[PDB]
Design an enzyme around this catalytic site. Sequence first.
Site, PDB file in Angstrom:
ATOM      1  N   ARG A 227       0.926  -1.485   0.221  1.00 46.21           N
ATOM      2  CA  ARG A 227       0.319  -0.150   0.294  1.00 46.21           C
ATOM      3  C   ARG A 227       0.466   1.424   0.121  1.00 46.21           C
ATOM      4  O   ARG A 227       1.105   1.256   0.646  1.00 46.21           O
ATOM      5  CB  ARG A 227      -0.620   0.034   1.025  1.00 46.21           C
ATOM      6  CG  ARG A 227      -2.015   0.790   1.666  1.00 46.21           C
ATOM      7  CD  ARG A 227      -1.409   2.398   1.538  1.00 46.21           C
ATOM      8  NE  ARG A 227      -1.722   3.614   2.229  1.00 46.21           N
ATOM      9  CZ  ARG A 227      -1.707   4.767   2.596  1.00 46.21           C
ATOM     10  NH1 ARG A 227      -1.245   4.735   2.935  1.00 46.21           N
ATOM     11  NH2 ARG A 227      -2.955   5.626   2.958  1.00 46.21           N
ATOM     12  N   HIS A 327      -7.986   5.802   8.567  1.00 44.23           N
ATOM     13  CA  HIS A 327      -7.308   6.008   9.326  1.00 44.23           C
ATOM     14  C   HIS A 327      -7.578   8.226   9.220  1.00 44.23           C
ATOM     15  O   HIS A 327      -6.407   8.891   9.848  1.00 44.23           O
ATOM     16  CB  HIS A 327      -6.391   6.168   9.436  1.00 44.23           C
ATOM     17  CG  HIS A 327      -5.106   5.702   8.184  1.00 44.23           C
ATOM     18  ND1 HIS A 327      -5.156   4.475   7.146  1.00 44.23           N
ATOM     19  CD2 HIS A 327      -4.184   6.619   8.039  1.00 44.23           C
ATOM     20  CE1 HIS A 327      -4.955   4.915   6.450  1.00 44.23           C
ATOM     21  NE2 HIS A 327      -3.858   6.128   6.317  1.00 44.23           N
ATOM     22  N   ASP A 328      -8.095   8.246   7.741  1.00 45.13           N
ATOM     23  CA  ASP A 328      -7.755   9.699   7.823  1.00 45.13           C
ATOM     24  C   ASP A 328      -9.432  10.581   7.530  1.00 45.13           C
ATOM     25  O   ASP A 328      -9.208  11.727   7.270  1.00 45.13           O
ATOM     26  CB  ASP A 328      -6.922   9.596   6.163  1.00 45.13           C
ATOM     27  CG  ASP A 328      -5.803   9.567   6.349  1.00 45.13           C
ATOM     28  OD1 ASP A 328      -5.323   9.904   7.922  1.00 45.13           O
ATOM     29  OD2 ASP A 328      -4.877   9.219   5.667  1.00 45.13           O
TER      30      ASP A 328
HETATM   31  O1  LIG Z   1       3.230  13.761  10.734  1.00 43.80           O
HETATM   32  C1  LIG Z   1       2.133  14.135   9.907  1.00 43.80           C
HETATM   33  C2  LIG Z   1       0.970  12.854   9.719  1.00 43.80           C
HETATM   34  O2  LIG Z   1       1.914  11.995   9.049  1.00 43.80           O
HETATM   35  C3  LIG Z   1       0.373  10.673   9.261  1.00 43.80           C
HETATM   36  O3  LIG Z   1      -0.782  10.581   7.722  1.00 43.80           O
HETATM   37  C4  LIG Z   1       0.162   9.924   6.877  1.00 43.80           C
HETATM   38  C5  LIG Z   1      -1.552   9.358   6.629  1.00 43.80           C
HETATM   39  O4  LIG Z   1      -1.960   8.876   7.806  1.00 43.80           O
HETATM   40  C6  LIG Z   1      -1.670   8.302   4.893  1.00 43.80           C
HETATM   41  O5  LIG Z   1      -2.427   7.294   4.948  1.00 43.80           O
HETATM   42  C7  LIG Z   1      -0.987   9.663   4.265  1.00 43.80           C
HETATM   43  O6  LIG Z   1      -0.548   8.627   3.416  1.00 43.80           O
HETATM   44  O7  LIG Z   1       0.909   9.985   4.641  1.00 43.80           O
HETATM   45  C8  LIG Z   1       0.510  10.987   5.755  1.00 43.80           C
HETATM   46  C9  LIG Z   1       1.560  11.327   5.590  1.00 43.80           C
HETATM   47  O8  LIG Z   1       2.809  10.318   6.005  1.00 43.80           O
HETATM   48  C10 LIG Z   1      -0.387  10.559  10.286  1.00 43.80           C
HETATM   49  O9  LIG Z   1      -1.401   9.605  10.187  1.00 43.80           O
HETATM   50  C11 LIG Z   1      -0.462  12.305  10.546  1.00 43.80           C
HETATM   51  O10 LIG Z   1      -1.337  11.502  11.883  1.00 43.80           O
HETATM   52  C12 LIG Z   1       0.121  12.744  11.108  1.00 43.80           C
HETATM   53  O11 LIG Z   1      -0.425  14.010  10.678  1.00 43.80           O
END
Ligand SMILES: OC[C@H]1O[C@H](O[C@H]2[C@H](O)[C@@H](O)[C@H](O)O[C@@H]2CO)[C@H](O)[C@@H](O)[C@@H]1O
Length: 686
Positions: A227, A327-328
């Site tokens: 992924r 998760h986002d």
């Molecule tokens: O530190 C920045 C954030 O990083 C992560 O966010 C990810 C996200 O979960 C993922 O789905 C996406 O593809 O990439 C970003 C950055 O790698 C953490 O999950 C966040 O809590 C942070 O704020």
Amino acid sequence: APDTSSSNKQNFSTDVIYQIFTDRFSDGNPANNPTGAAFDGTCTNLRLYCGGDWQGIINKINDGYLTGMGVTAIWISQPVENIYSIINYSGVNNTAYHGYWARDFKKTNPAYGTIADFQNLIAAAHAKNIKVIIDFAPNHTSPASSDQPSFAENGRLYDNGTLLGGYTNDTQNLFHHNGGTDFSTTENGIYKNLYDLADLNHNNSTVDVYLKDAIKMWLDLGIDGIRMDVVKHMPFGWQKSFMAAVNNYKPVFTFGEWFLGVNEVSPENHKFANESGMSLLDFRFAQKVRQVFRDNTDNMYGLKAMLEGSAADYAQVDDQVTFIDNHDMERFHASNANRRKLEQALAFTLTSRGVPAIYYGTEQYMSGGTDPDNRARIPSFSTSTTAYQVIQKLAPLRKSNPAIAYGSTQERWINNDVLIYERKFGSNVAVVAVNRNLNAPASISGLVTSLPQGSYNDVLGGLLNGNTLSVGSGGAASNFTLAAGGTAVWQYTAATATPTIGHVGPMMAKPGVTITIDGRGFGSSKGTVYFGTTAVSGADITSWEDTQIKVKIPAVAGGNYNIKVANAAGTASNVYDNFEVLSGDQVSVRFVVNNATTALGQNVYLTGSVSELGNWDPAKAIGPMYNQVVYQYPNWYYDVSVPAGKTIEFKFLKKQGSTATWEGGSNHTFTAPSSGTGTINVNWQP
Ligand SMILES: OC[C@H]1O[C@H](O[C@H]2[C@H](O)[C@@H](O)[C@H](O)O[C@@H]2CO)[C@H](O)[C@@H](O)[C@@H]1O
Ligand SMILES: OC[C@H]1O[C@H](O[C@H]2[C@H](O)[C@@H](O)[C@@H](O[C@H]3[C@H](O)[C@@H](O)[C@H](O)O[C@@H]3CO)O[C@@H]2CO)[C@H](O)[C@@H](O)[C@@H]1O
Ligand SMILES: OC[C@H]1O[C@H](O[C@H]2[C@H](O)[C@@H](O)[C@@H](O)O[C@@H]2CO)[C@H](O)[C@@H](O)[C@@H]1O
Ligand SMILES: OC[C@H]1O[C@H](O[C@H]2[C@H](O)[C@@H](O)[C@@H](O)O[C@@H]2CO)[C@H](O)[C@@H](O)[C@@H]1O
Ligand SMILES: [Ca+2]
Ligand SMILES: [Ca+2]
Ligand SMILES: [Ca+2]
């Protein structure tokens, strides 16, 4: 082995992925738990490590939680070693519990476990016929501050212990120093940092080789899929060369994350999924499902449009990973909402095209807003929730009914609140009826299906107020009442007589690589496989059975081919298009052209003497190229995947629509590097 086998790393359409936030799932080994301010065993502070690890996943695989649910694959947090820093963001501490802050891609995150733990996880999962997908984020390392190297770990990158460099004093140019992105343009979001995350420079030969070696290590550990993180923020050309490295070594199902907002339909997104060598998380699908089933901002006509549209826009719509949340996003289930909304959305996803992914805890009705509130520890491992039973009854259908795994999608009845669609593949059919209206029944008359004559019991057993269906001759169903919030599933399966291809993987590789052709009706005796007009039979067909063919790509010229097979008797199957035969191993090369003036709407593209450059065909030219960040107009640049060590002639084009203006003079020429990266800088020839 059959297409449905757990050893099939090229096809996840018959699977149901369970997305696990490792730290928030199950703490099976307290000994590897972080300590002090970086930990909270009660998991009340959702920004610190809670303890979830690989031994915990192993335990839940062994005690039947996932097996009993029908989950056949898991997607876990990035396994690589993250920084150990505890970052204070405006008075709030933050750790790398999410695994997105890499520091060494060739080592594991001790909080999750050791190499040996990862090995045991692979073994336990596979022993239970469960594939394992890992998150891999080659876009960046971790939070860093150029003028304050003491901040966190300065986004430092290590190669199995050996330090390669940090964000400060980046003399090697391992990272980008173009500032931060505001997401205003694709180019802006690729060559500038995402927030404060040290953006890796894939044009740096050291970074390029490092990452490709890194993924190989994980491929050798036995992962079944990948992924890819923020793929919209890495050079598409480099990513293609990355996918080629993977596929020309040990191909595994790979899908990237390209966020799409509500109502957003992106042609770029489509092109990336169709030409990069990987598929994508189906945000278009997820966002529409939320509008229709969760937020009430669109109706079934919108759901229908999304299904028919995406089926036309994605060359391999069946490789798109569908979901209803992650998760986002805020959990699909709102605390004060009727649980049937989540249940219907779930049933819809599990029976629709693509590769369904279920965010851990969904089956427990977890609620929660945006990060980190959507990443709470799973509160229960009960198998008695309605949602758990829904998944239990429907997930297995992707294995037993190929119509659901590979079938076409057709609307057979519809109005504002009701959608009855049909999946079909060979002698296999599935009809799904959904009534989103929680307070109003629906009178369904005039429903026509491809179902054989007879009575059909709802596969959900009435769990979601579904009903029995009566089909006469001609597939016409007799009038029935679809209950409020009603959801039903009717199916029919039987042996398929004619060869039918339902899936092919990988979809991009060089000659000699073995690809997997899955479907039904291939027969037990070796037949013939076609790459365009070229016939392959005998020894290069490594193995052959009714539902799966393993065959080596023939040494044909690089290009786009239609795949087709014929059984021992000579009967031909349907055509599976868009297969790309590479011209050989790939390297990422940055093409730069200076003094290329254009009018608004007109852009510069690249064309050349190899399929990777579209073999001189304007409609296949690479681009539009960039002219903002790394170089400024009238100079244009673009990173492209090209055959390693090949002498290539090329030219640049100025295109508006399909109208093209060619560079004058003779072709430009160069030889691609045998490995690592390269940069060619030339002037536009009038
Ligand atoms: O530190 C920045 C954030 O990083 C992560 O966010 C990810 C996200 O979960 C993922 O789905 C996406 O593809 O990439 C970003 C950055 O790698 C953490 O999950 C966040 O809590 C942070 O704020
Ligand atoms: O189609 C394969 C060939 O594609 C490329 O040829 C380009 C030329 O590079 C480009 O200058 C243009 O040539 C035209 C020329 O400018 C004009 O004077 C003449 O009357 O017509 C020419 C077109 O026929 O367009 C051609 C493509 O047609 C590539 O350079 C070449 O090596 C490939 O063989
Ligand atoms: O009967 C064939 C017909 O079935 C469906 O039409 C439904 C329609 O969707 C409902 O909203 C309502 O009007 O009843 C119709 C059937 O009587 C299909 O949608 C349609 O394409 C098909 O021709
Ligand atoms: O940067 C994206 C942009 O590039 C080109 O725009 C040029 C334009 O053609 C020139 O005449 C001049 O105005 O500089 C612009 C770039 O700053 C493309 O033509 C345009 O479509 C594209 O969005
Ligand atoms: Ca632990
Ligand atoms: Ca980037
Ligand atoms: Ca296709």
